[PDB]
Symmetry: D2
Subunit: 400 residues, 4 copies
């Protein structure tokens, strides 16, 4: 490293996203080199053995660690305010590696009712198949978590804003509940916010997981994830969760593209939220739109909590139309600028129907209990000029 985290404390977010974690190499390359290698050479046989026993620093194998990935891990941990970070080949790889490491057969988990489709599948149809009981509750009211707590509850998993409806959860209050019992941790999926908007570790969370694929990469060309938290737990996830349980190690090439994307994280998040506030206001005033969910609108139920724990309201807008699923299909198909695709946190504005697409693993009974309407549309607002996004949505909504 060149910029120490002590020097980085007084620096701004954009400055840290560019210079923090970066290492001054022998050639002095401005860009972090792509150390696209599988194995590393030891100077002596004794060095190799010391490296395996944790007695000497250095690299051994890319699944264990790589210098391109180290710069990215150090950079993410500095922004989130965590001791250490470990990158994975996907957002689900980060979620699974952390939960496989922190849990064992006989443990209990209190998870939020509204979660990302595959996360719900991993908890309901994955961890339950391996002798781990999971209780899903409406996390908006923290008292439901307190009620579902048990003497064997070793972890609490939350996601705020919840994908897709954007239901918020007070992190600081849930951390107080998690820390009431001796052996219990709070895992927060900070994919939607990024450390620019929200930092759950500072609010009380022990572990923070991300789907780097979305806003941290920002260019929709890398499937990746991160696990941020205390060094003691991150070393366990690196040498057990990824090394043995999942095998979800990130490629040095993909890690370089995330480093490249992070250089513009502050300016991308500012434009993303600037456009989303303008699009959400337009949707709220439009006749064809029945209800708009966005933390920036005064009509949002948890508007006071959005101001308290989020720097900006985000880029995602969930909304319901004055019509069934047929009306929603007509809007999606009429779009010429808004791209009809899955995923979020990209320069292209993406749009989709969560009932049949993202939250498809959820059965219709579980879907409606969480709050997914047959006709809800989730909009991931991109970096295009808000004038063109609004014009495209207007010509599509005016037809219905």
């Amino acid at each position: 490293s060149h910029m120490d985290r002590e020097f980085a404390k007084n620096m701004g977010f954009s400055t840290k996203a560019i210079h923090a974690g970066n290492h001054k190499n022998e050639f002095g390359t401005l860009a972090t080199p792509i150390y696209q290698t599988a194995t590393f050479v030891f100077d002596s046989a004794q060095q190799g053995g010391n490296r395996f026993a944790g007695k000497e620093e250095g690299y051994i194998y890319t699944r264990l660690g790589n210098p391109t990935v180290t710069v990215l891990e150090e950079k993410i941990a500095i922004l989130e305010g965590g001791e250490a970070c470990v990158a994975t080949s996907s957002g689900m790889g980060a979620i699974s590696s952390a939960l496989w490491t922190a849990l064992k057969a006989g443990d209990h988990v209190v998870a939020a009712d509204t979660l990302y489709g595959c996360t719900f599948a991993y908890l309901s149809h994955g961890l339950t198949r391996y002798g781990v009981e999971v209780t899903f509750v409406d996390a908006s009211n923290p008292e439901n978590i307190k009620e579902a707590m048990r003497p064997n509850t070793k972890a609490i998993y939350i996601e705020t804003p919840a994908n897709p409806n954007l239901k918020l959860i007070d992190i600081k209050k849930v951390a107080e509940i998690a820390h009431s019992k001796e052996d219990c941790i709070l895992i927060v999926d900070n994919t939607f916010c990024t450390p620019y908007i929200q930092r759950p570790i500072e609010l009380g969370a022990d572990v923070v997981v991300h789907s780097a694929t979305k806003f941290l990469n920002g260019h929709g060309d890398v499937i990746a994830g991160f696990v941020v938290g205390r060094k003691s737990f991150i070393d366990q996830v690196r040498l057990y969760g990824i090394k043995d349980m999942t095998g979800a190690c990130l490629s040095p090439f993909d890690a370089y593209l995330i480093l490249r994307g992070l250089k513009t994280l502050e300016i991308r998040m500012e434009r993303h939220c600037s456009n989303a506030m303008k699009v959400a206001k337009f949707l709220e005033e439009h006749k064809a739109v029945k209800k708009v969910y966005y933390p920036g609108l005064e009509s949002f139920e948890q508007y006071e909590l959005a101001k308290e724990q989020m720097k900006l309201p985000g880029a995602i807008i969930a909304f319901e139309l004055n019509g069934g699923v047929e009306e929603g299909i007509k809007v999606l198909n009429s779009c010429k600028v808004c791209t009809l695709a899955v995923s979020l946190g990209d320069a292209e504005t993406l749009i989709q129907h969560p009932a049949s697409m993202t939250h498809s693993p959820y059965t219709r009974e579980e879907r409606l209990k969480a709050g997914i309407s047959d006709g809800l549309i989730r909009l991931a607002v991109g970096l295009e000029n808000a004038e063109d996004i609004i014009a495209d949505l207007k010509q599509a909504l005016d037809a219905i």
Copy 2:
């Protein structure tokens, strides 16, 4: 696809490794394009829903599937003689995703006593922590597997040659034992051999796992894996093991580099084994070397089985010196051509001490039971001229 697997049946190995699985795209690029994307665009909202319900072919998200990865999966399945394949971000990702999918709490596994370090850790300290009993046996004698079989044994995991000592296991006889019980499968780790040398599916295995990092990539710059088997099981590993349990999805860039490496798989394996037969004979005749384990030497215990199930003897040579660990260190450090590093299946000849390096998770009690000597040296013979590899080893061994 351009070359159908019916046309590919009569073609040779090198021809299949170059043309099989390749798709003729709209531009007609000779090289497979690197579709470095995270999400894919649907032509209509109905198309998206049909794609998620499995009613229409096409792509949705790179974690689920990608066209660069599809060409590689089709190519590997054709060479191995399997119905389908699914790529992962690491060799351990392929092992874990297949075992997480095939097993549940209450199941039993009969695993080989000599296995790769992290595989042993995933079975002994991973699956056991999640209510799955595992019995390790000397798989060289198949009767030990038959004795360890139980009414709940849903899988048998084997690796032949076993890393590092190179102990062989008759696949056809173990498959007959696995198929005696209704719900039991045989998983074979064909990393060392590759489908050019050994094809366990044809011998009887249900599932074949690989660590693409080693000989299939061949250039030591990609950490990757594969799960080959019946389409029914491969779809379950793709949409459950990788999608939810591990998150070990392969990057399209890394997948392209494996496709690039496969173009020379036949010529690399031939040179690798050509040099290894010459190095092993030299080591056997050298005074300082006590015992050499290599399937090509007539001194090998399972020499008849090596001829029956392997096309060539491979590139790995395990050997013991007429001296302790100090003598082995002196040999490793004296090397100028043989690179002192971990991993195998690369142009550079790699050399290491398994006791302190690869099989370090094994405790000294478990290590000696499997057959790992304090002083054993595993040599991954590269593609350099055998004259220079032998000359380098001679000047190092003559000093002791």
Copy 3:
């Protein structure tokens, strides 16, 4: 996907993301990296038709590649030109265009203040091949008209241009170039980008760029572009690049420029926002003798900067109240500003030509070229302006 006619009414950011992009058979959101050398023909007739220019399609990457085509169409749409052709460097674009447009016996009227290597290519390159070149102070357009000759086939200008960032009225120079029948105006729009300045609309025939700088924006690709009429761009593609220079761009590098262009509007806005703040600070600072920046009211050509540039840019040249020793002290004292050549990157780059670039030059030679003892060129990055200003203050306060 998005036709040039539909893109006309769209904003800059929207065009930089969606214009030029092609909807492929798989529907990848990101443009695929067609990393290939040659392309396959469906029949022998198809190959012949493509070589005769009768049928559309690809033949070889040096001639053309689909990743590069998307980038070329995108750049031509933003600049308002008919066609574009990418090169492996900024100098490759400059040389390929001039080698194509000129022959032995022709004359060129070039600006006196140009990029170091451009001046070398004109003074030592084209003169060595029977091409006379007259260098003039292009700020006053009357000097260009005086240096015009009956054989002047081209006029090369760069605005702004080092050392003091002087400007050239493009519309006035185009009127001079078009007074003679066979004469063109080539403008190096590297500093401005089509977001700030579009010389084709003002009158220029050809526009060259060094994509390495602001168009890529991440300092990891050496690349260039030649924009102009299709008739001349086809000649540069099939003669200048194909035969004279061989400066063809890699599809991988082309993809990274496409990735960088997704945030061009937001990067240029932040770059100029920070530069206006840094320039005002430097002007008010005691240790700074003079500041050259098109945004300050003290700038000589302030009216022309507002007339032909949307924003004043990101480059700031400034004189110190001190010699070469003071300039060395300031640069070495920097802890945020990076000591490196080049411009248009997230990292703020700082250079002192007297002690770094023009160091072989003697003091007499330096002053003839226009490099003073305390001249410092600053390429303002995307970090928070408060941290850039704080770093410059602690360095400049030491020399008071």
Copy 4:
């Protein structure tokens, strides 16, 4: 890691893997991809010293890059030259070397049979810039000596060369070039590679390559090299590439060539092994009128092929007992041989110049250039020779 002196006694494969490689601070086995545009100086003095050539180090990727340096040293070691400089294309290497070595008023004696674009660069390029070029039948060296003039500063040759793969005795032409004081011999060693032919040892001053072909070997990188004395290579780096052409190679493309070179010996051996088998088959086949291949005893310059080439190469030109229509039928009938231009790839490429490359040319123009109605150039790949021969047999049997 491996010095040029230690590499002297090592074999070709060993040098192609270990020579030129640099032991970096992390000890990565694979050469890192230093994908950067600019490099950071530790002090203002360091930057100045590097610009004055007094201190070693990097400044900008167009000038030099560490990934490219490892590749340049590796190529120069194999060719037996003092220094090498990489370019973004084969034509970039040819043009940069000729632009550097020549000036207006100089004369060049070039071979009559050369690569299409090389002939265009000499006949239409250099002649347009006051450089006279005389083309002669280089098979008889007396024609070169007759075309020599007091201003002949260079002689350009290519051996073997299309259409009929004619050879040129390098050692005899070097004696002619060195008879005059200021004259050099440039040899295009694309077809042979330093494994088959090393023109510097035979007498050549400069050796140019199109790395796209056999050195890369995987048909995914357009690149070139200029090998020769350090004095001339420094001039080509800091004048030919830096200013005249701008043909600098990308670090990513340079890495892929390094990856491809790891298997150069084994690829060239298989390429020539298959080509000798295919050429013998074609010679004995009834529908084939004549076969040009340096390995057949029917070859005119068979003694010279054994004298200056280790192996006869992978390219086979052959005449059919039929016109253009028969040649079209044969190519369209192929199911394994790929219809594409270029050479030196795992896929066997087949081309019929009469109906594909020289299709704009009329029949009278085709015969003057040397392209007959039934001439077919075949770049033999790495597939099994039995499948290549079987594919050619079913295509040639249809035209009997």
